[PDB]
Scaffold this active site. Structure first.
Site, PDB file in Angstrom:
ATOM      1  N   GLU A  35       0.819  -1.205   0.000  1.00 51.92           N
ATOM      2  CA  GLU A  35       0.000   0.000   0.000  1.00 51.92           C
ATOM      3  C   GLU A  35       0.858   1.262   0.000  1.00 51.92           C
ATOM      4  O   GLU A  35       0.577   2.197  -0.755  1.00 51.92           O
ATOM      5  CB  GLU A  35      -0.933   0.009   1.205  1.00 51.92           C
ATOM      6  N   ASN A  46      -7.382   9.863  -5.840  1.00 51.39           N
ATOM      7  CA  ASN A  46      -8.210   8.976  -6.645  1.00 51.39           C
ATOM      8  C   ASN A  46      -9.149   9.785  -7.534  1.00 51.39           C
ATOM      9  O   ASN A  46      -9.391  10.968  -7.295  1.00 51.39           O
ATOM     10  CB  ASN A  46      -9.046   8.062  -5.747  1.00 51.39           C
ATOM     11  N   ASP A  48     -12.292   9.708  -7.803  1.00 53.76           N
ATOM     12  CA  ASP A  48     -13.548  10.112  -7.175  1.00 53.76           C
ATOM     13  C   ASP A  48     -13.383  11.305  -6.234  1.00 53.76           C
ATOM     14  O   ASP A  48     -14.337  11.666  -5.535  1.00 53.76           O
ATOM     15  CB  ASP A  48     -14.227   8.923  -6.476  1.00 53.76           C
ATOM     16  N   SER A  50     -11.439  11.433  -3.656  1.00 51.58           N
ATOM     17  CA  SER A  50     -10.909  10.986  -2.384  1.00 51.58           C
ATOM     18  C   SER A  50      -9.398  10.835  -2.483  1.00 51.58           C
ATOM     19  O   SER A  50      -8.808  10.861  -3.565  1.00 51.58           O
ATOM     20  CB  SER A  50     -11.518   9.640  -1.989  1.00 51.58           C
ATOM     21  N   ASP A  52      -6.133   8.519  -0.410  1.00 52.43           N
ATOM     22  CA  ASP A  52      -5.713   7.482   0.521  1.00 52.43           C
ATOM     23  C   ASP A  52      -4.507   7.972   1.314  1.00 52.43           C
ATOM     24  O   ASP A  52      -3.544   8.490   0.736  1.00 52.43           O
ATOM     25  CB  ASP A  52      -5.356   6.196  -0.224  1.00 52.43           C
ATOM     26  N   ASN A  59      -8.795   5.491   3.140  1.00 54.14           N
ATOM     27  CA  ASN A  59      -9.524   6.320   2.181  1.00 54.14           C
ATOM     28  C   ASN A  59     -10.414   7.370   2.845  1.00 54.14           C
ATOM     29  O   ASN A  59     -11.087   7.110   3.843  1.00 54.14           O
ATOM     30  CB  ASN A  59     -10.369   5.407   1.287  1.00 54.14           C
TER      31      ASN A  59
END
Ligand SMILES: O=C1C(Br)=CC(=C(c2cc(Br)c(O)c(Br)c2)c2ccccc2S(=O)(=O)O)C=C1Br
Ligand SMILES: O=C1C(Br)=CC(=C(c2cc(Br)c(O)c(Br)c2)c2ccccc2S(=O)(=O)O)C=C1Br
Ligand SMILES: [Cl-]
Length: 129
Positions: A35, A46, A48, A50, A52, A59
């Site tokens: 990750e 991301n 959308d 968002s 991380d 998220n």
């Protein structure tokens, strides 16, 4: 902070992750490796809107609040900036909530693809834990 493998394994063990939700410690170390590459300050945006955050790439649409993500639910009840600390406590406490929901560790796409189905015990092997 960038952790070493056994350094992180020991920190995760101290926070009760070995066998948490049935997932052995090596699962959690492997998840962090793929990750974030063991980087507590990792952030990835991301499509959308968002982002991380942190060592476990938590998220901002579902789990932490970053104040800029449409549809935020903040299910960990934590500001995302706390997930960029050098100490992993806040990320571990939120990860425990995630794994109890995101259908186990499948919530971590890198774990799903790069850890699940492999001998993840190798990630803790030879560490003094
Ligand atoms: O407090 C610490 C700190 Br500081 C660093 C490290 C390590 C380390 C090694 C390398 Br090489 C590296 O690039 C990084 Br970052 C850290 C390390 C040292 C000996 C054996 C295994 C590791 S390891 O398994 O954790 O890697 C362990 C602890 Br405990
Ligand atoms: O700042 C550090 C650094 Br860097 C390394 C280490 C350790 C270590 C060192 C080596 Br070398 C190694 O091969 C392995 Br595995 C672990 C260590 C970690 C946990 C428990 C016992 C040790 S102990 O072995 O030092 O007693 C502790 C601190 Br604090
Ligand atoms: Cl192996």
């Amino acid at each position: 902070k960038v952790f070493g493998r056994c350094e992180l394994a020991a920190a995760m063990k101290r926070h009760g992750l070995d066998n948490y939700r049935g997932y052995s410690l090596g699962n959690w170390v492997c998840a962090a490796k793929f990750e974030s590459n063991f980087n507590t300050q990792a952030t990835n945006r991301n499509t959308d809107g968002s982002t991380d955050y942190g060592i476990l790439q938590i998220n901002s649409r579902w789990w932490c609040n970053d104040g800029r993500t449409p549809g935020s639910r903040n299910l960990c009840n934590i500001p995302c900036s706390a997930l960029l600390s050098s100490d992993i406590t806040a990320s571990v406490n939120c990860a425990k909530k995630i794994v109890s929901x995101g259908n186990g560790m499948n919530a971590w796409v890198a774990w799903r693809n790069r850890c699940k189905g492999t001998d993840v015990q190798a990630w803790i092997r030879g560490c003094r834990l």
